[PDB]
């Protein structure tokens, strides 16, 4: 299963926050999703189809070593504080998820 780090990230309101999801993929058929616990999908890699007039503060990018992914949130808000994880979606052959351990985000005033 993918790993998700750091286990605790503390940032200030308005700042950027970046977790790293490391997933050793055996193929290009996978979808790497970023979730928040109530799970709610925030973003994916590859990114879902774009829609005009719809912008997102959450992004998943693949680093050049191919194993690591950055899960970035911009303009962090107080209510973004919570529990997050990433999961890899693939065919089992049935649809299957492999979830990372959970990590915590804390967004503080100022």
């Amino acid at each position: 299963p993918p790993t998700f780090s750091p286990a605790l990230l503390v940032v200030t309101e308005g700042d950027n926050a970046t977790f790293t999801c490391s997933f050793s993929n055996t193929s290009e058929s996978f979808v790497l999703n970023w979730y928040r616990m109530s799970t709610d999908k925030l973003a994916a890699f590859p990114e879902d189809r774009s829609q005009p007039g719809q912008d997102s503060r959450f992004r998943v990018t693949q680093l050049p070593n191919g194993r690591d992914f950055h899960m970035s949130v911009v303009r962090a808000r107080r209510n973004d504080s919570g529990t997050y994880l990433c999961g890899a979606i693939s065919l089992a052959p049935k649809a299957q998820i492999k979830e990372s351990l959970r990590a915590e985000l804390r967004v503080t005033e100022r």
Partner: antibody
Amino acid sequence: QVQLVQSGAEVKKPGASVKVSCKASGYSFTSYWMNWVRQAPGQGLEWIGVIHPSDSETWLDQKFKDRVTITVDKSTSTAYMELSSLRSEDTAVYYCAREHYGTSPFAYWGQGTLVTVSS
Amino acid sequence: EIVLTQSPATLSLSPGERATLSCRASESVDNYGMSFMNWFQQKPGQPPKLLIHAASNQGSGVPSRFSGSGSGTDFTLTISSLEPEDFAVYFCQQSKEVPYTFGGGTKVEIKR
């Protein structure tokens, strides 16, 4: 480019077996599930089964569990589907199809192999 | 098995018109915050070609006019402006569970 090239059309008598090839190229063969699907003339699409070429893990639709064998030869990047005890109702175009985008089992297709079963 | 029901059986439209195709599943396609529904186009003598996966995302090189929507048990394929090369049969297919299953198809034919 991902390419899946199947063997040619076959005409078979009832009771016979047919072994269809799918030659894969343009990607790493052992990293993606390979599916088999058939379509009867003017008819809709029916999944037969799937194999993962890395370890030959195989899942078959219950309808075909006792007449179908799906195999791979890693040395030639070729997948095979062998259908036994052929019946008139097996006349169909048989397709191999490769997964992609981590949820789509059917994302790349071979050109199809017509198998006509007749006396 | 998850049974897929497509409607209407046939759509009779002109180039430039909007085509809206429906696919209903006998139980939910969804898992992990996603929808496991795929759409294909098929012309005579050819294999199907994937247009949509995870039932709004596009396959490679699929024109902008093809879009997918829906969740749970109700899905839609939209072609916002028909081109002559779009008159085809279209299939939906789910990947949430095996056996993988297909709808019966919707033929988009030329109105005259």
